[PDB]
Structure formats: structure tokens, C-alpha cells
């Protein structure tokens, strides 16, 4: 930090310097005297078994506290991270299970693609044994469009493998046929599901313990249920594959947000629906008592009049109202017999229809389902805010990108080297594993803070790179305070000297 | 992206409803056609793509849902409650919720 | 150096020409306090010098 030649010679360029740089880490900590210092430590070997999937989840799952710091949750997850790393190190011995578990993401992605393709093919070619689409020119147009998209891979942007696989499946359908292709896809999907569940079991490590816990785990139940669904689709009937779309809906975040919004306002929706049911019941009672003859409905009888009296009982009136009035823009008045101006009950019919339209159709129906839309919009806004703040704010210190505007160190460097959550985790693991007798000053201080459950040693809105340049500005009121203290001390000393001189003169 | 995902969700729901109708309500998908200058009625939901197309078009373009095109049942039919539940679920799920969720973002933006 | 601090930021000479009297409120107090502290320091130094001379 003070010699330039040593820094030049310590650059990486089997290479000793490269190995040491790769296995060395640094962090910044705050001491009890509100001073920031940099601690450089070696990365313990155990930390090398942390999965990138776990890293990504810990990154894009944490929630800020009231103040706006994720350090509390990141520290609380340290024990789970250490246990997962230990389990991965243990699993490294097993070749087959580790090999299957390494590619868990691949199995899931290809299973997703297989399910989508199977559903699409079933929709476009079921039942089979007309195959009009097999000869219709539109299929050729889609094939050409997919070929153009695949050729556009020169520009990259991804989304190229999927159209290629779609074209391959189309060619397979053209050559072998539809049924053989569906059977092949189903067999591949079943094998993929088996491999994925095996990989999940290996990663979670419940197999080492009794299989009762493995079977008890909710995710294992989910996987086995969908395996049962897949085998049912493969053997009993093809249409059972449609149930797989529930897995896709659950996996996709945006689609699951709709269900989350519906579930969150469940009670309000139920109460408003009960109010609508009450109003429908009252209207049905009124109609049955005073408008029995006007509930005539038209029915297309299967291969005996074309009209029937609906509101004969009360349940029939309730059902007909709740169905037709709610499914018709104009209300219940669009199904009832059209009255004439000369009828006695024409004003009553007019009032009935207008009240139903204004109360049930325009107010209650909108009140039932406005909450869902509002919650969906709020969830989308919150997700956008979280994504924006995750890419323009440091995880640990919380400083924004604007601060690192013209400084010697950019925001990328600050988040890569200076303040690295993974480096902090490695330091925590090193403190927990290393013997107490061998602790240094900073290590003992951090261990004591951890034991006392205090998170003040993390940097909060402070960076050494920024303070290095802000020191001159910061040392403005401090100098004035020091000068005032020195003046007060000098005055006190002068007063003491005067008092001593007066006492000596008196004596 | 949000619009596309919501449209895919609507397509999934339409596919499920079409499957249910094809399996249990095949005979109720009768549509009226004005043939060009040979019956005036045709069976729409014979295949599965036809059911999907008819649903996605008519149910989405009709305020009351898919139940405004299907054959009107009678109180004495066995599947009358099933038809009622089908129509109400389609109206409450696809017409009132998903359709508005797809295009509210555009107005807000 | 790529510094944009030479542009005026929420400051205008026309406004400051009239706001000078109001602005020069805490500055005068600070100057008076500094002058008083300097006078006290000078008096203490003079007293110390006189005491040293008397002792010598
Ligand atoms: C390629 C398209 C080639 C088309 C050629 C011509 C044929 C044309 C007709 C139309 C095709 C339109 C299908 C369009 C969308 C295709 C899939 C799609 O774009 O949507 C996807 C997912 O939602 C669905 O699967 C959506 C479910 C689709 C419903 C399937 C049944 C439809 C049958 C009735 C419709 C009949 C229409 C009648 C007219 C979202 O898009 P995505 O890119 O984010 O998907 C990823 C991707 O799958 C990753 O592998 C996956 O990673 P893992 O989680 O690790 O497995 C990601 O998962 P997460 O991010 O959640 O962690 C997914 O999020
Ligand atoms: C005609 C109408 C058609 C449309 C009507 C709407 C249909 C709705 C579709 C989508 C909404 C339903 C989605 C249900 C999701 C169930 C679920 O969330 O499934 C997983 C849970 C896990 O449990 P957890 O919360 O402890 O895991 C939390 C930890 N994380 C997040 C890492 C897993 O397990 C379970 O519920 C196990 C459930 C087993 C399911 C077997 C299915 C075969
Ligand atoms: C989605 C619904 C899929 C229903 C499905 O594929 O029906 C399959 C079979 C229909 O053909 P078939 O051979 O029986 O009739 C003979 C038909 N011919 C002659 C054409 C072969 O119907 C059957 O199996 C009938 C017995 C079961 C019917 C109820 C199935 C309920 C399935 C799914 C809904 C709930 C899933 C879980 C949701 C939560 C997940 C988180
Ligand atoms: C696409 C389909 C179209 C529209 C959406 C319809 C949804 C129907 C209801 C499905 C309920 C369901 O699938 O629920 C699943 C949840 C399981 O949550 P989890 O912990 O596994 O989720 C983990 C993640 N986390 C904790 C953050 C939520 O179960 C629960 O919440 C348990 C039930 C809670 C109360 C539900 C209220 C029912 C509302 C009815 C009104 C419906 C009006 C429209 C007709
Ligand atoms: C809980 C709230 C209830 C509110 C009820 C009070 C509404 C406002 C107050 C009074 C309305 C008085 C209208 C006077 C009608 C007298 C009766 C009558 O005989 O005339 C009924 C007229 C149509 O004329 P017309 O049948 O005489 O035929 C003319 C040809 N000729 C003579 C050959 C038969 O219809 C009509 O005024 C029908 C008027 C229907 C009421 C207006 C809509 C209220 C909105 C509700 C939401
Ligand atoms: C995923 C959620 C599914 C929810 C399903 C459960 C809904 C609520 C629970 C139970 C409803 C029980 C209704 C009792 C009906 C018994 C069957 C029956 O025979 O009566 C069907 C009645 C009409 O009377 P009827 O055919 O006897 O004709 C009367 C004249 N006679 C006797 C000469 C033929 O219709 C009816 O209740 C049709 C009722 C249709 C269901 C109500 C709407 C549900 C909303 C969904 C959104
Ligand atoms: N404090 C932080 N603030 C913001 N993002 C961070 C922070 N710490 C880590 N990250 C994210 O993690 C990335 C660095 O993670 P990591 O060191 O594991 O990457 P890597 O690809 O494995 O590195 P390499 O292969 O060069 O060794 C950063 O680019 C950023 O995406
Ligand atoms: Ca020691
Ligand atoms: Zn930082």
C-alpha cells in the first residue's frame, strides 16, 4: 500500500502469484472507535464448495429491513450457507450423485422446454389417427419464420436454441409421424423428471438420513406428484400432459404474481361475493313474488317447447339471475320477457332492471375484482423497484452508483473487490472455523461482536475510497472544535497560574 | 414482456377450458354460419384446435364469455349445473381478471 | 479535470446583491468570536511573558 515497486511485482503477470491472488480475499470493517480498516485474509478451502445457484438465490431473495440494510439477513443465512458448503464437500466424494446434482438447472430447463413442446404439439395435432395442419400452408410459413430466427443467431441475443428445437420436432413429426414423436417426447420427459428428482435429492442431502424425511419433504411430494402426472400422460391418456402447465405457472414469477394477488385479498373477495349473493337472493325473491311469469328462457332442446319457465322454484330464479344477469352487460333485464307500455307492471320492471344494473353490475362486480388488479400493479411496481435498487446500490454499504462518478475506483470495482458479500461470508467462516488461540486482533473483535449479536462492524454508508478524498472536507468542524478546546485549555492554565501567583503573594 | 406472459396465461386457461369442453361438452359447441351463395349450423369443437380457436375468439370478444355461443341447456338436463359452473368460472377468471390485467399496464404507463 | 463546479448552482449575483445583508449575520458573530479568542490568547501570552520576566 506504500511501495509502488512491490505492487508492480505482486501482479499475477501453476503461477504462485495468481494462485495466491485467487485464494486471497480482503474486506473492510469498522472498529469500536468508529474507524474503518482493511483486513486481508486467506480464503479457507471449505468456501470453494458454495454453489452458484445458492449464491444467486441469496442475492435475489434477500429483503431489506426497516432502515434498508440486508446485512442482518445475510448474516443470519451464514449458518445455512456453511452447512450447505459442508454437505457439498461431503457429496464431492460420491461421483454419480454429484455428477447428477451438478446439472440440476439443466434438467429443469429441458423439462420445461419438453413440457411446453408436448403441450403445443398436443394442441396442434390432437386428436390424431385429419391432420389438416400437417398439409396447411401456414405450417410452412411458421417453419420459414423459425428458420429466419435461427439464421438471425449471428446477432446473438439468445432465443435461438428453442426455435431450432421446434424446427427439429416439426421435421421429426413430418418424417416419423405424430404418435411416435409424442411417445418419444413423453419418454424423454419422464426420464428427465426422474433425473431431476434424483438431482434434487442429492443436492438437499436428505437421502443420507432415513428416507422418511425425504418422502416427507414437501418439494419431494411435488416432484413425485408431477412424475405421477407425467406417467399418467404417457400411458393412460395424452391430455393429462396439460396438468404440467401448472408447474410452469408456479415456476414463472410473473404468472405466479396473479395467483399471489388473488390469494392476498381472498377474504375481501369472499365477503364481496357474499354481498353479491345476498343482493341476487333479494332480487330473486322479488321476481318470484311479483314477476314469476316474466322468467321465460329459450332452450335449444337436444335431438318440448322452445321456451321454458325458469323462475318456478326459488333456486332456479337464483341460478338464472346469478348466471345471466352477471354474464350480461345490461343485467337481468336482457333475458326477461319484454313488456309493453300498456302493462300495469311496466314501471316496476323498469325500476327493477335499472336498480339491478346500477347496483350489481356497475358497483359490486367492479368492487369484487378491482383489488386483484391493484395488487398486481403494486407487486409489479415493487419488483421493478427491487430490481432497480439491486443494480444501483451496494449490498453491504448501500452507497449509490452516483457517488463513484469520477473517483479513481468505479462502482464495479467497489462491489467486486472492496465490499464483497462473499468475501464477508468467507471471513465469517474463517472466524468460525479457526481456533480461538490463533485469532488476531480484528478476528477476535469480529468474533466478540458475533457472539454479542451486534452487526455494527459492517460498513454503513461509509467507504475508504470515498473518505480518502472526503477527508479534507470532513476536517472542517473538527479543526474548529480542536482550536476551541485548545483555547479553553490555555485559558484554564492561565487562570490556574494567576491563582497560584495570588496564593503565593498572599502567603 | 408482462403483456406476453399474461397473454400466455390466458392461452393456458383457454387451452384448459377447451380440453374440458371437448371431453365433457362436445355436443354443445354448435355455431351458426351464413354460408356463401349445407346446414346453417356446424359442430365447432370436433377437434381440439377448433375448440381453442372458437373459445379464444368468441369468449374473449363476448362480454358474457364462452356461454353466449354454446347451446342453451334446460333445467332437466343432467349437465346443467356443470354448464353453469363452467360459464361462471370462465366469466370470472378469463373475462373479468386476465383480460383487464393484460391491458391495464398500458393505460397506467 | 472534468469538473463542473464552475457553473452557478442555485446562486445568482442579482439575488446575492440584496441578500448580502441577511447572509452576513452568522459570519459577523463568528468573526467577533474569533477576534475575542485571539485577544484572550494574546492577553494570556502577555501574562505568561510577564510572569517569566518576573521569575528571571
Ligand atoms: C417457441 C414457440 C414455437 C411456436 C411455433 C408456432 C406454434 C405457434 C403457437 C404458439 C406458441 C406460443 C408459446 C409461447 C411462449 C413459449 C414459452 C414462453 O415464452 O414462456 C416462458 C414460460 O411460460 C410458458 O412456458 C408459457 C406456456 C405456453 C402454453 C403451451 C400450450 C399452448 C397450446 C395452445 C395454444 C394454441 C394456439 C392456437 C393459435 C417464459 O419465458 P422464459 O424465457 O422466461 O422461460 C424461461 C425458460 O423456460 C428457462 O428454461 C427457465 O429456466 P429454469 O427455471 O431453470 O427451468 C425459466 O424458468 P424461471 O425463470 O421461472 O426460473 C423460464 O422463465
Ligand atoms: C379450469 C380452471 C383452471 C384454472 C384454475 C386455476 C389453477 C391454478 C394454477 C396455479 C396456482 C396453483 C399453484 C400451486 C402451487 C403449490 C406449491 O406451492 O407447491 C409447492 C409446495 C412447496 O411447499 P413450501 O411452501 O414449504 O415450499 C416453499 C419453498 N420453495 C419456494 C423453494 C419451493 O408444495 C406443495 O404445496 C405440494 C403440492 C403438490 C401438488 C401436486 C400436483 C400434481
Ligand atoms: C386439465 C384437465 C385435464 C383432464 C384430462 O386430461 O382428462 C383425461 C381423461 C379424458 O379421457 P378418458 O380416457 O377419461 O375418456 C375417454 C376420452 N377419449 C375417448 C377421447 C379417449 O379424463 C379422465 O381421466 C377422467 C377422470 C379424471 C377427471 C378429472 C381430472 C382432473 C385433473 C386435473 C385438475 C386438477 C389438477 C391439479 C391442480 C393443482 C396443481 C398444483
Ligand atoms: C391462472 C388462474 C387464474 C386466476 C387465479 C385464480 C386463483 C384461484 C385460487 C388458487 C389458490 C391457490 O393456488 O393457493 C395456493 C396457496 C399456496 O401458497 P404457498 O405458500 O405454496 O405459496 C408460496 C409463496 N407465497 C407464500 C409468497 C404465496 O394456498 C393458499 O394460499 C391457501 C388458500 C388461501 C386462501 C385462498 C383464497 C381463495 C380465493 C377465492 C376467490 C376467487 C375469485 C375468482 C374465482
Ligand atoms: C328505490 C328508488 C325507487 C325510485 C322510484 C321513483 C322514480 C321517480 C319518481 C316518479 C316517477 C313517476 C313517473 C310517472 C309515470 C306514471 C305512470 C304511467 O302510467 O306512466 C308510466 C310511464 C310510461 O308512460 P305510460 O305507461 O303512461 O304510457 C304512456 C302512453 N299511454 C298514456 C297511452 C299509456 O313510465 C314511467 O314513468 C316509469 C318510470 C320508472 C321510474 C324511473 C327510473 C327510476 C330509477 C331507478 C334507479
Ligand atoms: C371451483 C368452484 C366450484 C364450485 C361448485 C360448488 C357450488 C356451490 C355448492 C353447491 C351447489 C348446490 C346446488 C344444488 C343443486 C342440486 C342439483 C339439482 O338438481 O339442481 C340444480 C339446480 C337447478 O335446479 P334443478 O335442476 O333441480 O331444477 C329444479 C326443477 N326440477 C326439480 C323439476 C328439476 O342448479 C343449481 O343449483 C346449479 C348450481 C351451480 C353452482 C353455483 C355457482 C358456482 C359458482 C362458480 C364460480
Ligand atoms: N456488494 C455487492 N454489491 C453488488 N453486487 C455484488 C456485491 N457483491 C457481489 N455482487 C455481485 O456478485 C458479482 C461477483 O460475484 P463473484 O465474485 O462470485 O463472481 P464470479 O463470476 O464467480 O467471479 P470470478 O470468476 O471473476 O472469480 C458482482 O459482479 C455482482 O454481480
Ligand atoms: Ca495468542
Ligand atoms: Zn460497498
Structural determination approach: cryo-EM
* CB atoms closer than 10 angstroms to residue A363: 13
| The C-alpha cell that represents A84 in the structure block | 450447505
With beta carbons less than 8 A apart as the criterion, state whether A46 and A89 touch: yes
Backbone angles phi, psi at A307, to 5 degrees: -125, 145
Rounded to whole angstroms, how far apart are CA atoms A55 and C48? Answer: 69
Rounded to whole angstroms, how far apart are CA atoms B97 and B91? Answer: 9
Nearest ligand (C-alpha, residue A436): 8
- Distance (Å) of CA A27 to CA A37, A405, A418: 9, 22, 6
Residue A213 DSSP symbol = H
Closest CA to A75 of A414, A430, A450: A450
Closest CA to B75 of A461, A319, A255, A174: A319
Tell me whether residues A323 and B12 touch, CB distance under 8 A: no
With beta carbons less than 8 A apart as the criterion, state whether A457 and A29 touch: yes
Q: Give the CA-trace dihedral at A190, A192, A194, A200, to 10 degrees.
A: -150
| The C-alpha cell that represents A183 in the structure block | 411417445
With beta carbons less than 8 A apart as the criterion, state whether B72 and A298 touch: yes
| The C-alpha cell that represents A230 in the structure block | 407425467
Rounded to whole angstroms, how far apart are CA atoms A235 and A74? Answer: 47
Rounded to whole angstroms, how far apart are CA atoms A195 and B14? Answer: 31
Rounded to whole angstroms, how far apart are CA atoms A78 and A81? Answer: 5
Rounded to whole angstroms, how far apart are CA atoms B23 and B6? Answer: 26
Closest CA to B70 of B40, B31, B41: B31
Strand blocks (E) in chain C: none
- Distance (Å) of CA A283 to CA A308, A349, A364, B11: 20, 12, 14, 36
Nearest ligand (C-alpha, residue A113): 1
| The C-alpha cell that represents A17 in the structure block | 502469484
| The C-alpha cell that represents A477 in the structure block | 468542524
Closest CA to A58 of A39, A84, A90: A84
Closest CA to A292 of A310, A319, A315, A278: A310
Closest CA to A434 of A139, A64, A41: A41
Q: Where are the alpha helices (DSSP H) in A326-440?
A: 326-327, 346-356, 365-390, 411-413, 421-433
Maximum Cα interatomic distance, chain C, rounded to a whole number of Å: 62
With beta carbons less than 8 A apart as the criterion, state whether A59 and A111 touch: no
3-state DSSP call for residue B42? strand
Please report how many Cα atoms fall inside a 13 Å half-sphere around the Cα of residue B108, on the Cβ side: 13
Closest CA to B65 of B8, B10, B9, B7: B10
Burial A84-111 (b: 16+ CB within 10 A, else e): bbebbeebeeeeebbebbeebeebbebb
Cβ neighbours for C23, distance < 8 A, ≥ 6 positions apart: C16
With beta carbons less than 8 A apart as the criterion, state whether A397 and A68 touch: no
With beta carbons less than 8 A apart as the criterion, state whether A323 and B87 touch: yes
- Our CA-based measurement puts residue B100 at a distance from the nearest CA of chain A, in whole angstroms, of 8
With beta carbons less than 8 A apart as the criterion, state whether A83 and A203 touch: no
Residue A34 DSSP symbol = S
Closest CA to A19 of A28, A10, A30: A10
Rounded to whole angstroms, how far apart are CA atoms B98 and A199? Answer: 36
Rounded to whole angstroms, how far apart are CA atoms C53 and C47? Answer: 10
Strand partners, B32: B41
- Distance (Å) of CA A197 to CA A209, A220, A413, B11: 17, 7, 39, 29
**Annotated binding residue A407:** no
Please report how many Cα atoms fall inside a 13 Å half-sphere around the Cα of residue C40, on the Cβ side: 17
- Distance (Å) of CA A189 to CA A226, A227, A235, A345: 11, 9, 13, 65
Tell me whether residues C48 and A487 touch, CB distance under 8 A: no
Closest CA to A27 of A466, A413, A420, A442: A420
Q: Is A13 exposed, middle or buried (0-12, 13-18, 19+ CB in 10 A)?
A: exposed
Residue by residue, DSSP assigns A238-306 as GGGGGGGHHHHHHHSHHHHHHHHHHHHTHHHHHHHHHHHHHHHHHHHHHHHHH-GGG-EEE-------S
| The C-alpha cell that represents A453 in the structure block | 449479536
Strand blocks (E) in chain B: 30-32, 41-43
- Our CA-based measurement puts residue A322 at a distance from the nearest CA of chain B, in whole angstroms, of 9
* CB atoms closer than 10 angstroms to residue A125: 22
Closest CA to B29 of B81, B86, B78: B86
Strand partners, A25: A41
| The C-alpha cell that represents A83 in the structure block | 452447512
Rounded to whole angstroms, how far apart are CA atoms A426 and A81? Answer: 10
> CA gyration radius for chain C?
22
| The C-alpha cell that represents A394 in the structure block | 451496494
With beta carbons less than 8 A apart as the criterion, state whether A464 and A39 touch: no
Element (H, E) at A71: helix A71-76
Closest CA to B13 of B64, B65, B62: B65
User: CA of A237: which chain B residue's CA is closest?
Assistant: B23
Chain B residues in contact with A300 by the CB 8 A cut-off are 30, 71-72
Strand partners, A24: A42
- Distance (Å) of CA A327 to CA A144, A276, B92, B95: 42, 14, 9, 10
Cβ neighbours for A182, distance < 8 A, ≥ 6 positions apart: A118, A121, A122, A238
Residue C25 DSSP symbol = T
Chain B residues in contact with A309 by the CB 8 A cut-off are none
| The C-alpha cell that represents A383 in the structure block | 419488483
| The C-alpha cell that represents A74 in the structure block | 445475510
Maximum Cα interatomic distance, chain B, rounded to a whole number of Å: 50
Rounded to whole angstroms, how far apart are CA atoms A91 and A64? Answer: 33
Rounded to whole angstroms, how far apart are CA atoms A215 and A218? Answer: 8
Cβ neighbours for A320, distance < 8 A, ≥ 6 positions apart: A295, A297, A310, A311, A335
Rounded to whole angstroms, how far apart are CA atoms A199 and A98? Answer: 8
| The C-alpha cell that represents A432 in the structure block | 468460525
**Cα angle: A45, vertex A48, A54; to 5 degrees:** 145
With beta carbons less than 8 A apart as the criterion, state whether A399 and A460 touch: no
Q: Where are the alpha helices (DSSP H) in A92-136?
A: 95-102, 104-125, 132-135
Residue A393 DSSP symbol = B
With beta carbons less than 8 A apart as the criterion, state whether A214 and A154 touch: no
* CB atoms closer than 10 angstroms to residue A450: 16
Cβ neighbours for A233, distance < 8 A, ≥ 6 positions apart: A118, A186, A239, A240, A241, A243, A244
With beta carbons less than 8 A apart as the criterion, state whether A218 and A225 touch: no
With beta carbons less than 8 A apart as the criterion, state whether A125 and A134 touch: yes
With beta carbons less than 8 A apart as the criterion, state whether B67 and A327 touch: yes
With beta carbons less than 8 A apart as the criterion, state whether A254 and B5 touch: yes
**Cα angle: A401, vertex A404, A407; to 5 degrees:** 170
CA of A392 to the centre of ligand 5 (A): 66
- Our CA-based measurement puts residue A494 at a distance from the nearest CA of chain C, in whole angstroms, of 6
Please tell me which of the candidates A124, A310, A329 has its beta carbon nearest to residue B49: A124
* CB atoms closer than 10 angstroms to residue A281: 15
Handedness of CA A184, A189, A192, A193 (dihedral sign): negative
Q: How far apart are the first and last CA of chain B?
A: 14
Which residues line ion ligand 9, judged by CB < 5 Å? A 394, 396-397, 419
Rounded to whole angstroms, how far apart are CA atoms A233 and A188? Answer: 13
Rounded to whole angstroms, how far apart are CA atoms B41 and B12? Answer: 28
Rounded to whole angstroms, how far apart are CA atoms A418 and A463? Answer: 9
Backbone angles phi, psi at A29, to 5 degrees: -135, 155
Helices A178-204 and A95-102 meet at what angle, rounded to 10?
A: 120
Rounded to whole angstroms, how far apart are CA atoms A485 and A74? Answer: 43
| The C-alpha cell that represents B4 in the structure block | 406476453
Residues of C within an 8 Å Cβ radius of A: 2-3, 37, 40-41, 44, 47-48, 51
Q: Is B73 exposed, middle or buried (0-12, 13-18, 19+ CB in 10 A)?
A: buried
> Any idea which residue has 480475499 for its cell?
A25
Closest CA to A79 of A429, A318, A363: A429
CA of A311 to the centre of ligand 2 (A): 41
With beta carbons less than 8 A apart as the criterion, state whether A334 and A328 touch: yes
With beta carbons less than 8 A apart as the criterion, state whether A398 and A460 touch: yes
Tell me whether residues A497 and C51 touch, CB distance under 8 A: yes
Tell me whether residues B74 and A316 touch, CB distance under 8 A: no
| The C-alpha cell that represents A167 in the structure block | 424446427
Please report how many Cα atoms fall inside a 13 Å half-sphere around the Cα of residue A20, on the Cβ side: 8
With beta carbons less than 8 A apart as the criterion, state whether B44 and B57 touch: no
Helices first, then strands: H and E counts in chain B: 5, 2
Amino acid at each position: 500500500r506504500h511501495n509502488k515497486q512491490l505492487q508492480h511485482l505482486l501482479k499475477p503477470v501453476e503461477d504462485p502469484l495468481a494462485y495466491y491472488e485467487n485464494h486471497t480475499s480482503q474486506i473492510e470493517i469498522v472498529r469500536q472507535d468508529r474507524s474503518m480498516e482493511q483486513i486481508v485474509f486467506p480464503v479457507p478451502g471449505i468456501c470453494q464448495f458454495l454453489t452458484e445457484e445458492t449464491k444467486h438465490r441469496l442475492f435475489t431473495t434477500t429483503e431489506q429491513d426497516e432502515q434498508g440494510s440486508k446485512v442482518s439477513d445475510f448474516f443470519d443465512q451464514s449458518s445455512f450457507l456453511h452447512n450447505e458448503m459442508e454437505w457439498q464437500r461431503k457429496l464431492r466424494s460420491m461421483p454419480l450423485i454429484y455428477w447428477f446434482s451438478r446439472r440440476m438447472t439443466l434438467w429443469g430447463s429441458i423439462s420445461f422446454n419438453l413440457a411446453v413442446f408436448i403441450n403445443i404439439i398436443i394442441a396442434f395435432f390432437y386428436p390424431y389417427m385429419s391432420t389438416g395442419v400437417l398439409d396447411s400452408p401456414l405450417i410452412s410459413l411458421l417453419f420459414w419464420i423459425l428458420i429466419c430466427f435461427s439464421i438471425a443467431a449471428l446477432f446473438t441475443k439468445r432465443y435461438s436454441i428453442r426455435p431450432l428445437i421446434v424446427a427439429l420436432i416439426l421435421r421429426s413429426i413430418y418424417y416419423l409421424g405424430i404418435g411416435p414423436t409424442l411417445n418419444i417426447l413423453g419418454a424423454l420427459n419422464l426420464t428427465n423428471k426422474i433425473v431431476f428428482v434424483v438431482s434434487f435429492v442429492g443436492n438437499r442431502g436428505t437421502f443420507i438420513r432415513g428416507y422418511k424425511a425425504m418422502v416427507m419433504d414437501m418439494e419431494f411430494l411435488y416432484h413425485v406428484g408431477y412424475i405421477l402426472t407425467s406417467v399418467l400422460g404417457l400411458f393412460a391418456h395424452e391430455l393429462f400432459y396439460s396438468i404440467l402447465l401448472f408447474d410452469l405457472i408456479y415456476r414463472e414469477e410473473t404468472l405466479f404474481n396473479v395467483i399471489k394477488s388473488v390469494t392476498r385479498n381472498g377474504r375481501s373477495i369472499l365477503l364481496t361475493a357474499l354481498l353479491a349473493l345476498i343482493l341476487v337472493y333479494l332480487f330473486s325473491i322479488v321476481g318470484f313474488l311479483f314477476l314469476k311469469d316474466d322468467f321465460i328462457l329459450e332452450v335449444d332442446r337436444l335431438p318440448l317447447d322452445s321456451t321454458e319457465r325458469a323462475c318456478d322454484t326459488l333456486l332456479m330464479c337464483i341460478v338464472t339471475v346469478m348466471n345471466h344477469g352477471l354474464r350480461n352487460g345490461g343485467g337481468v333485464g336482457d333475458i326477461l320477457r319484454k313488456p309493453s307500455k300498456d302493462e300495469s307492471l311496466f314501471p316496476a320492471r323498469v325500476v327493477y332492471d335499472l336498480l339491478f344494473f346500477f347496483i350489481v353490475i356497475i358497483i359490486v362486480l367492479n368492487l369484487i375484482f378491482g383489488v386483484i388488479i391493484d395488487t398486481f400493479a403494486d407487486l409489479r411496481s415493487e419488483k421493478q423497484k427491487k430490481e432497480e435498487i439491486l443494480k444501483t446500490t451496494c449490498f453491504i454499504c448501500g452507497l449509490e452508483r452516483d457517488k463513484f462518478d469520477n473517483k479513481t475506483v468505479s462502482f464495479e470495482e467497489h462491489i467486486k473487490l472492496e465490499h464483497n458479500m462473499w468475501n464477508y461470508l468467507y471471513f465469517i467462516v474463517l472466524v468460525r472455523v479457526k481456533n480461538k488461540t490463533d485469532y488476531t486482533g480484528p478476528e477476535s473483535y469480529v468474533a466478540q461482536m458475533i457472539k454479542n449479536k451486534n452487526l455494527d462492524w459492517f460498513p454503513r454508508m461509509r467507504a475508504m475510497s470515498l473518505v480518502s478524498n472526503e477527508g479534507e472536507g470532513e476536517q472542517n468542524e473538527i479543526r474548529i472544535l480542536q482550536d476551541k478546546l485548545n483555547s479553553t485549555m490555555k485559558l484554564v492554565s492561565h487562570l490556574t497560574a494567576q491563582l497560584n501567583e495570588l496564593k503565593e503573594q498572599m502567603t
